[PDB]
Structure formats: C-alpha cells, structure tokens
Design a protein around this nucleic acid. Structure first.
Ligand SMILES: [Ca+2]
Ligand SMILES: [Ca+2]
Length: 291
DNA sequence: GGATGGGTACCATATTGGTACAAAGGG
DNA sequence: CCTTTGTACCAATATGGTACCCATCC
C-alpha cells in the first residue's frame, strides 16, 4: 500500500486546498475543496490516492483530464488528519494552514451559509483573501473594507523522508534522453522545476541526492530547475535511489525506459549503431510520446 | 420556502518536456 | 580529437485554480 509520505510529496507537487464563496440570494456559501487534477492516463494513481483516503470524495473524468475532489466537511476531516501528521513542505503548506483555519470555523458553527452581516463570514473572507488567487472582483465589490489575513511564512524546510521525494517527483519530475542533432551522441537528464517562490527548497535537492545543480528555467527568473546530467551521478545516486523509493503512475514507465537507456550507456553500447538505434526507439515512445 | 451535494464548464500559468551547442577534460 | 556536461532556449499545455446550476434533502 501507498506510503503516507508519498501521498504528501505528491500533494506538494499537484494538490490544492481551496475555499470558494458563492452567493445564493442574500446568503453566501463557503465551499471548501481539496483537489488533485491530472491528465487522464494517470486515473489509476488517483484511484490509489482516493483509496488511501478511505474512498472519500469523487473522481470525475473528461476525455483528457481527471479530477479527485473532496468537498464535504465530514470527508475533509480525514484529509486534514493526514496532513497534520505528515506535513507539506512547499508554499502549499500555507494555503493548507489557512484552509485548516476556515474549516475549524465552519465546524464550530455547524453550517456553511451566512448572511452578509455574519462576523464568522468576514473572518473567513479575510482568510480566503490570502489563499490561492485571493478574492474575486465580485466579492471584492460586496466587501470593500476587508483586510486580508497574514499568510504564514514557509522557510528552511527539510525533506522529511525519501518517500516524499518519490511522491514529489512522481508529480514534477522529468526523465529525458537527449540525442544530438548530428545523431552521434546520447546523454541523460533528470530535471525538476518549480516556481521561484520555492527556490530555497529546490536548492536543497542538491544536498538530498548529493549531486547535480541548480539553474533558472527561463530569462524571466520566475522559475528554477534542479538538474542532474553527469552520468556517474545518474547511474550511482539517482537510479539506485528510485529503485528503492519507487515512483508511481505512468512516469514509472518513463523511469524504467530511462533506466534501460542508462544500462546501455554503462556498457558503452550507446557508441554502437544498433545501440544508438535501440535508444532512439525507446526515446520515441517515452514521456509525451507514450502510446 | 431554504440548505447542501455534486456534476461539469471555464480560466491562467507553472510546469511539461523538447531541442541545442560550446567548453570542458581526459590519455 | 572526441565525447560528456553545464547551460541555454522556449512553445504550449497539463496542471492548479474558480464558477454555476439544479436535484434532492430537512
Ligand atoms: Ca506543481
Ligand atoms: Ca505532473
């Protein structure tokens, strides 16, 4: 069964803690939701997660994407137990803390709809304001004088367990095989990207794997990547590491194919014509080219 | 009446992930 | 000379997010 730190690592990568407000004829409803949305080829892994959470919530599917949503207050309590015991470490931790606060207010009040004059409602709107994309312009018109709450700082966070990294990479990792345009040479890369708001966390990856380096992703500097390329490191640190703490979902297959190329390179087979042919074949069917 | 659940449409960008080469750097 | 590595480039979409509407429950 799926390890709990894997579930957390995967949520730091792809999950969401949201509170939304809707008007319902002179009353506002507070709608909490926890959400994971993936491309449809990973429905299977969503099923394993939903399962981990006592089959709370529901999956929905639309030809290209699939979505796990947990929206009822009963169901949400068990989600919150998990993340209290196995804490997030990305900036997503802060949206989770704010989320948790609102949930507690709703439980204290035993209900989800409020008349504009409610004090609890204003406290909630104040907190909602510092979450995710903040207030809508519609709500902003109806509550002009609300001061957003303090967004908690998330600093100096350590990777709590290797299984977190397996979850996280199952979410944001990428395994590549580079061929030269001249078609002579082959190399590998393992990359993880993130928004610049988590540059600190990503720089500590160099320490975790004990190799690789850290770059900006584009001229904007609004995103950064962790990268390993050096083949000694890939073959001695990165691959053994993930043979033990296994990645999951379709990305597992890309990791298997990547591993296969890596063995051919170990044995020098990448400098043979057939070896290069086999590697090109493997490459043409991995990642976004996968059947 | 009113409240909640849940399916599904819709929005925006942080990833998703492909390419490329010059400068190491070895024997 | 020859092959690996660090770094760069960047288009677009798989993600992270939000809204609306109604059937059914109290
Ligand atoms: Ca993410
Ligand atoms: Ca992903």
């Amino acid at each position: 069964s799926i390890n709990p730190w894997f579930v957390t690592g995967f949520t730091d990568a792809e999950g969401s803690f949201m509170i939304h407000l809707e008007k319902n004829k002179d009353k506002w409803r507070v709608r909490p939701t926890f959400q994971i949305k993936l491309d449809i080829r990973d429905k299977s892994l969503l099923e394993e997660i939903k399962n981990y959470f006592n089959n709370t919530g529901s999956i929905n599917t639309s030809n290209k994407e699939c979505v796990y949503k947990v929206r009822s207050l009963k169901d949400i309590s068990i989600i919150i137990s998990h993340f209290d015991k196995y804490n997030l470490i990305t900036q997503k931790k802060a949206d989770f803390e704010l989320f948790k606060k609102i949930i507690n207010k709703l439980n204290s009040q035993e209900h989800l709809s409020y008349e504009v004059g409610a004090t609890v409602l204003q406290e909630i709107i104040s907190i909602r304001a510092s979450m995710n994309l903040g207030l809508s312009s519609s709500v902003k018109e109806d509550f002009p004088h609300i001061i957003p709450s303090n967004r908690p700082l998330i600093e100096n966070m350590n990777i709590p367990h290797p299984e977190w990294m397996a979850g996280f990479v199952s979410g944001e990792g990428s395994f590549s095989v580079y061929t030269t345009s001249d078609d002579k040479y082959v190399s590998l890369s393992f990359r993880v990207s993130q928004h610049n708001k988590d540059k600190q966390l990503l720089k500590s990856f160099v320490d975790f794997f004990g190799c690789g380096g850290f770059n900006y992703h584009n001229k904007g500097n609004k995103a950064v990547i962790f990268v390993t390329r050096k083949f000694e490191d890939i073959n001695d640190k990165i691959i053994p590491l993930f043979n033990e703490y296994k990645i999951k979902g379709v990305k597992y297959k890309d990791f298997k194919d990547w591993s296969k190329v890596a063995k051919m390179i170990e044995s020098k087979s990448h400098l043979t014509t057939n070896g290069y042919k086999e590697i090109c074949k493997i490459k043409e069917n991995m990642n976004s080219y996968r059947k």
